[PDB]
Amino acid sequence: SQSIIAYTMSLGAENSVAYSNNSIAIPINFTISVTTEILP
Amino acid sequence: IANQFNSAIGKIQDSLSSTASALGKLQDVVNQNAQALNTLVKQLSSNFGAISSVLNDILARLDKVEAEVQIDRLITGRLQSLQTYVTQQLIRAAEIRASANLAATKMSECVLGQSKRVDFCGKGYHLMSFPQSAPHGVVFLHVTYVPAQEKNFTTAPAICHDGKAHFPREGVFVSNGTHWFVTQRNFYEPQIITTHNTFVSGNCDVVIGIVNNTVYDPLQPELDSFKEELDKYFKNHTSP
Amino acid sequence: VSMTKTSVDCTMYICGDSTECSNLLLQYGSFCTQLNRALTGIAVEQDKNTQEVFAQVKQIYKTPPIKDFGGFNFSQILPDPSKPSKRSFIEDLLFNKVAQKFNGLTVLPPLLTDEMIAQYTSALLAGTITSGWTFGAGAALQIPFAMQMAYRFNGIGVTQNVLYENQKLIANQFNSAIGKIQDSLSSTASALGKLQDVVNQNAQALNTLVKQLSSNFGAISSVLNDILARLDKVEAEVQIDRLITGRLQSLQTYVTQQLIRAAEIRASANLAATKMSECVLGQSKRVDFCGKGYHLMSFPQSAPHGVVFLHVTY
Amino acid sequence: TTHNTFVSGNCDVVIGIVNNTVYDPLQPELDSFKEELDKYFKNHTSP
Ligand SMILES: *[C@@H]1O[C@H](CO)[C@@H](O[C@@H]2O[C@H](CO)[C@@H](O[C@H]3O[C@H](CO)[C@@H](O)[C@H](O)[C@@H]3O)[C@H](O)[C@H]2NC(C)=O)[C@H](O)[C@H]1NC(C)=O
Ligand SMILES: *[C@@H]1O[C@H](CO)[C@@H](O[C@@H]2O[C@H](CO)[C@@H](O[C@H]3O[C@H](CO)[C@@H](O)[C@H](O)[C@@H]3O)[C@H](O)[C@H]2NC(C)=O)[C@H](O)[C@H]1NC(C)=O
Ligand SMILES: *[C@@H]1O[C@H](CO)[C@@H](O[C@@H]2O[C@H](CO)[C@@H](O[C@H]3O[C@H](CO)[C@@H](O)[C@H](O)[C@@H]3O)[C@H](O)[C@H]2NC(C)=O)[C@H](O)[C@H]1NC(C)=O
Ligand SMILES: *[C@@H]1O[C@H](CO[C@@H]2O[C@@H](C)[C@@H](O)[C@@H](O)[C@@H]2O)[C@@H](O[C@@H]2O[C@H](CO)[C@@H](O)[C@H](O)[C@H]2NC(C)=O)[C@H](O)[C@H]1NC(C)=O
Ligand SMILES: *[C@@H]1O[C@H](CO)[C@@H](O[C@@H]2O[C@H](CO)[C@@H](O)[C@H](O)[C@H]2NC(C)=O)[C@H](O)[C@H]1NC(C)=O
Ligand SMILES: *[C@@H]1O[C@H](CO)[C@@H](O[C@@H]2O[C@H](CO)[C@@H](O)[C@H](O)[C@H]2NC(C)=O)[C@H](O)[C@H]1NC(C)=O
Ligand SMILES: *[C@@H]1O[C@H](CO)[C@@H](O)[C@H](O)[C@H]1NC(C)=O
Ligand SMILES: *[C@@H]1O[C@H](CO)[C@@H](O)[C@H](O)[C@H]1NC(C)=O
């Protein structure tokens, strides 16, 4: 069933933020994340 | 905070273990140098336009004068092949040096304290980082605060109480949609707008969007707890 | 941010459809397998260098189509939908101002074309105007544009009331500086001179390698197929090994000059990626790093081979 | 003011220190309050 399908590539799903001269978004919760960065 | 922290390390432990190529920058340098070494020896199979790569055969079939006129091809060939190796090694070592200067900068700024740099100590708001060794390199365990979850709110630039315009000392004025509060720009924790949360600058004429509410000053009700105490002494002195 | 992917087919430059030359080039073994790997490593690195700077966003942020920014008049810096490519009026300025030949050279396209580097620079901008810095460090979060400017002002330590009691003038002097930039880029080209420099280094480097196919290198003749028209087997190969030697040195030097160049372009892109990360996604508390004053915010526009910044300063 | 500044020391050590009479904005807001009391004294002596 699987084949080497080819496409024009995508950067992400469309996300306009609903901006206006009086609207805000302030967070109620947060993650303590960890990431690894590896340097030669 | 601690449960998230302990879960994040506990996830990183498995993530580094599981997928095929997650240390790929260190695979890349242990591969590329070993591939060039293997190549530098394999080039001793090539003729360089001579009669054999096996140099003793150029004494076995050719003699004292003309053997030089073979050999000079094997010398310039092998020596060019070594120049090709050393020039690559100088370039690729500067690529490693150019990492190592970033590594020492990242080390100082992300481990020996708290850089405010955006996406420098990794994604999110850098909190702190931990150094781990690897063969030929370093892994940084970057710990960060990331905004996760949020509610829709409206904000005022300023508050009109006295017709004079009031501004946060810190944070942002927001409404829950009926009342207003003063809160920090990175996390929802409201307070009633006081003179301690705020300062005054001019009046509501020059400024766009400015909203209408009163600002509370704890002096007023504190001194009303004092006016009532006074009023009880003023009335009571009528009596003795 | 990146060069053109000029790559040389290490057989065809040395041996123009000739097995006679190719068998003598096999007498040097694996060199071309490594020169091909050396130019390939440059080509791979241009995609990565374009990605590290422009794929600094993990969603496609977008403006609302109505534009209530308090007189901060971004009209020329956002993409224009009426353009075939979705590019801005600055980008319609920039994009004017900067198959195998018989010599065996080749040229390849970038992984991301001008539609895609523009959509990335459009998101890097649209997160900036809709979401402050926050898209660099979490989920997207709406804020009013003048409140972005308020926070910024307090950030450089001017008190936030100083924005408010001059806003209608502030936004105009900001638009006045945007206007001067559009006139400036319409008036000049030497300012783009750093993008001109990389392509001109590559233009004369290509031109050098081409001239070397006309060199005699001490041989009877400077062209291979001209020799194949006149000699046979021994007095021919004594000439073919030479052409091979002289051209082989041309490739060694060409790839040396390019490899030390590819380090200039990588370092330049790494700096550009930190300035996406720290000027555009953020607010620099570092003197003279983003602009030549206190930094307020930075806006990126795609260019041929690179990026220009509108670095905006108090 | 007492809300623009923080206290330190005593006025001998700091080279360059000027004199200037500060404003404590509590001081008139307890005086505007003292004179309201002074009017209730000037009333309460009368009946
Ligand atoms: C916007 O924020 C306001 C503050 O949180 C909120 O009003 C507050 O509502 C709570 C109850 O949900 C009240 O708490 C009191 O409720 C009754 C009052 O009779 C008592 O039984 C309780 O013991 C308690 O005293 C708060 O007093 C009230 N605060 C004020 C100043 O009104 C609004 O409801 C929020 N708006 C929306 C749309 O949710
Ligand atoms: C924000 O709060 C302001 C103060 O309450 C308010 O302005 C006030 O609006 C009333 C009602 O229109 C005015 O009342 C009288 O004003 C003039 C006379 O001066 C007359 O022309 C009117 O007919 C009316 O009799 C107040 O004078 C006025 N006060 C001030 C200080 O402006 C704003 O309207 C409020 N704005 C919003 C959007 O909430
Ligand atoms: C800043 O204001 C200070 C307060 O007025 C002032 O200090 C005062 O200086 C004078 C002169 O030295 C002193 O005057 C007294 O000195 C001794 C007693 O200490 C007597 O012999 C004198 O007759 C006289 O009474 C003040 O006592 C002294 N006050 C204080 C609290 O230190 C500074 O001189 C002023 N400086 C400037 C540059 O304005
Ligand atoms: C926060 O609100 C945005 C949008 O704002 C609201 O939009 C209308 C529905 C109306 O209620 C307005 O008065 C508000 O201003 C939410 O964005 C929506 O997200 C859904 C998916 O969850 C999407 O399908 C819609 O197209 C979006 N609507 C708009 C207008 O953009 C957002 O999800 C809210 N987030 C939270 C956590 O409250
Ligand atoms: C922030 O989100 C976390 C989840 O990432 C919340 O923690 C969970 O809370 C629910 C109950 O609401 C529990 O059932 C889970 O077991 C919790 N998980 C963990 C890791 O504790 C957390 O409560 C949220 N914090 C705030 C203050 O909103
Ligand atoms: C924002 O700035 C641009 C100029 O850079 C303004 O565009 C001009 O607008 C008028 C009216 O539509 C036209 O006659 C001009 O030809 C436009 N020029 C360009 C290059 O588009 C735009 O109107 C300004 N908007 C605001 C709100 O000031
Ligand atoms: C009134 O003041 C007197 C002393 O002057 C005191 O004894 C008395 O308890 C007070 N009574 C009331 C009602 O406060
Ligand atoms: C005393 O106080 C009353 C109100 O309690 C007021 O009517 C009257 O005018 C006051 N008298 C004086 C002398 O101020």
Side-chain angles (χ1 to χ4, degrees):
Chain A
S1 59
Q2 295 226 132
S3 66
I4 298 177
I5 284 147
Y7 51 88
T8 172
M9 75 175 280
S10 62
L11 304 73
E14 192 277 329
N15 196 37
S16 182
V17 178
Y19 167 92
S20 66
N21 76 347
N22 55 1
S23 191
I24 194 166
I26 298 302
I28 186 64
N29 198 4
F30 57 99
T31 58
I32 299 72
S33 61
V34 179
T35 69
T36 81
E37 175 61 289
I38 313 102
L39 306 183
Chain B
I1 319 303
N3 298 159
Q4 288 208 69
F5 180 67
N6 300 348
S7 185
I9 298 302
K11 283 172 295 192
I12 284 307
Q13 179 270 270
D14 274 350
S15 180
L16 284 172
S17 191
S18 302
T19 189
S21 51
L23 294 79
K25 290 162 286 204
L26 265 294
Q27 300 296 97
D28 190 49
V29 67
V30 78
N31 289 350
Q32 267 199 317
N33 297 298
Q35 187 54 54
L37 291 173
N38 288 1
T39 302
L40 182 62
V41 176
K42 280 179 192 187
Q43 215 67 269
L44 308 182
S45 63
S46 302
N47 280 307
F48 310 91
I51 62 176
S52 175
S53 54
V54 183
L55 176 60
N56 297 322
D57 301 328
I58 296 100
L59 314 180
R61 289 208 290 263
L62 292 192
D63 73 45
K64 288 58 175 179
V65 299
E66 68 277 357
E68 182 260 7
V69 185
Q70 286 296 311
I71 285 170
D72 64 17
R73 308 229 77 72
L74 295 179
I75 290 177
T76 188
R78 297 186 179 184
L79 192 60
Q80 175 172 235
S81 303
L82 174 58
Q83 284 210 17
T84 305
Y85 170 83
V86 184
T87 187
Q88 166 272 104
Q89 279 289 291
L90 293 165
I91 291 285
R92 201 189 289 159
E95 181 196 334
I96 292 294
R97 187 176 185 88
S99 183
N101 290 335
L102 167 69
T105 306
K106 193 170 298 292
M107 189 84 190
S108 303
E109 295 177 23
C110 306
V111 181
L112 288 69
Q114 183 192 25
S115 114
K116 194 55 163 281
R117 302 183 62 181
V118 174
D119 199 1
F120 176 65
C121 314
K123 59 178 60 163
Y125 297 100
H126 176 251
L127 215 65
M128 68 182 80
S129 313
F130 311 125
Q132 301 304 309
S133 322
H136 294 319
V138 64
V139 180
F140 289 97
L141 310 177
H142 304 297
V143 193
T144 84
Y145 168 108
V146 170
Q149 302 169 352
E150 159 271 315
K151 289 191 71 174
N152 270 300
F153 271 59
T154 183
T155 179
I159 288 164
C160 295
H161 177 198
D162 308 324
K164 310 184 296 184
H166 296 144
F167 299 81
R169 293 181 177 271
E170 178 284 331
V172 55
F173 301 138
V174 306
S175 184
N176 75 342
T178 60
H179 296 69
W180 295 263
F181 308 99
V182 62
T183 198
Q184 65 189 339
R185 304 167 192 163
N186 303 293
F187 182 91
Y188 185 64
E189 191 260 311
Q191 296 201 336
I192 297 95
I193 301 103
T194 80
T195 51
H196 296 277
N197 317 95
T198 61
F199 70 91
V200 59
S201 199
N203 69 293
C204 297
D205 43 12
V206 75
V207 173
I208 197 63
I210 195 167
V211 309
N212 283 321
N213 173 43
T214 188
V215 305
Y216 180 88
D217 57 308
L219 184 174
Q220 185 214 19
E222 185 62 276
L223 272 67
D224 286 348
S225 94
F226 206 70
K227 187 269 174 179
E228 65 107 87
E229 181 182 67
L230 170 63
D231 189 32
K232 269 197 180 188
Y233 301 170
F234 262 129
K235 75 191 292 190
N236 186 44
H237 172 232
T238 66
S239 69
Chain C
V1 167
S2 55
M3 62 165 74
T4 45
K5 294 176 186 180
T6 49
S7 180
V8 186
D9 187 52
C10 186
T11 297
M12 183 174 168
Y13 180 80
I14 311 293
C15 308
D17 316 321
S18 167
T19 289
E20 306 85 341
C21 175
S22 304
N23 276 349
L24 286 165
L25 192 60
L26 289 171
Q27 299 197 21
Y28 300 86
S30 64
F31 269 145
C32 279
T33 309
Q34 179 271 328
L35 284 316
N36 292 298
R37 297 182 180 180
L39 293 176
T40 300
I42 293 176
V44 170
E45 173 145 59
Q46 300 327 293
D47 292 334
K48 178 271 298 186
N49 288 344
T50 303
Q51 171 247 311
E52 282 198 288
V53 67
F54 277 21
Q56 178 45 357
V57 286
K58 294 295 183 291
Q59 198 69 304
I60 49 166
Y61 307 112
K62 191 200 295 185
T63 187
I66 194 70
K67 196 218 73 193
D68 51 320
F69 303 133
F72 286 87
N73 193 22
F74 309 140
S75 57
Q76 309 322 113
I77 72 162
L78 277 295
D80 174 354
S82 71
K83 305 307 181 183
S85 54
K86 309 312 193 190
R87 66 183 64 179
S88 80
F89 185 43
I90 297 291
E91 291 177 317
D92 269 345
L93 262 300
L94 289 166
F95 287 13
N96 302 350
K97 291 307 303 185
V98 180
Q100 186 156 67
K101 293 187 176 281
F102 188 92
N103 58 43
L105 112 174
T106 60
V107 182
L108 282 65
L111 177 58
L112 308 102
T113 196
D114 88 295
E115 297 300 327
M116 291 192 76
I117 78 193
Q119 286 143 20
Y120 273 118
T121 214
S122 172
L124 283 160
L125 176 54
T128 295
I129 74 189
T130 60
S131 197
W133 49 60
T134 64
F135 73 103
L141 294 174
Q142 73 224 337
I143 177 75
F145 187 79
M147 298 330 100
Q148 308 194 177
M149 281 292 280
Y151 277 117
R152 298 300 182 88
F153 270 50
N154 189 78
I156 67 167
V158 307
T159 70
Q160 52 188 358
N161 49 318
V162 183
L163 168 64
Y164 300 119
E165 72 196 74
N166 207 54
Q167 283 170 272
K168 65 183 291 294
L169 200 169
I170 289 171
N172 178 37
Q173 53 185 153
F174 169 83
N175 300 343
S176 306
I178 293 187
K180 278 196 297 283
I181 287 291
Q182 186 282 332
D183 286 322
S184 181
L185 294 170
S186 193
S187 306
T188 206
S190 62
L192 295 78
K194 318 194 71 173
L195 303 172
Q196 307 291 17
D197 193 17
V198 48
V199 181
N200 177 31
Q201 284 181 320
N202 300 154
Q204 72 197 338
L206 181 170
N207 199 148
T208 299
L209 193 64
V210 171
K211 283 174 65 182
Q212 286 289 25
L213 292 160
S214 296
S215 289
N216 203 8
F217 294 125
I220 56 173
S221 179
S222 58
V223 174
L224 190 80
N225 285 300
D226 176 89
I227 298 168
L228 299 177
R230 62 213 278 178
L231 283 299
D232 62 7
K233 297 310 315 170
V234 304
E235 41 172 16
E237 286 203 325
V238 175
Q239 323 302 331
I240 312 303
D241 84 324
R242 236 171 268 260
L243 286 172
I244 280 162
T245 299
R247 306 186 184 186
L248 182 65
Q249 191 156 19
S250 309
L251 252 289
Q252 276 286 334
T253 56
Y254 172 81
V255 184
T256 299
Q257 297 309 97
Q258 281 293 110
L259 275 171
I260 188 58
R261 176 175 297 87
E264 298 165 7
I265 301 310
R266 175 210 302 143
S268 181
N270 183 306
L271 182 58
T274 69
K275 291 170 71 139
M276 255 341 86
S277 306
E278 294 207 59
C279 311
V280 177
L281 262 62
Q283 170 50 29
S284 68
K285 287 71 160 183
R286 306 207 312 211
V287 183
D288 300 353
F289 174 56
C290 310
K292 293 302 192 283
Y294 302 108
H295 174 266
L296 288 178
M297 58 184 69
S298 290
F299 312 105
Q301 273 72 28
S302 61
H305 294 303
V307 62
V308 304
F309 320 124
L310 308 184
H311 277 191
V312 191
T313 181
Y314 180 115
Chain D
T1 82
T2 60
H3 316 306
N4 294 93
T5 62
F6 65 96
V7 66
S8 188
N10 75 296
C11 305
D12 44 18
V13 66
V14 184
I15 186 160
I17 189 163
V18 300
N19 302 309
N20 177 82
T21 56
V22 312
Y23 208 64
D24 181 30
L26 263 282
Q27 195 180 320
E29 291 312 275
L30 60 91
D31 278 356
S32 51
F33 189 100
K34 179 64 152 187
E35 305 333 299
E36 172 188 2
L37 152 58
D38 220 297
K39 281 186 169 188
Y40 305 161
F41 268 131
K42 265 63 172 188
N43 204 321
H44 194 212
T45 49
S46 307

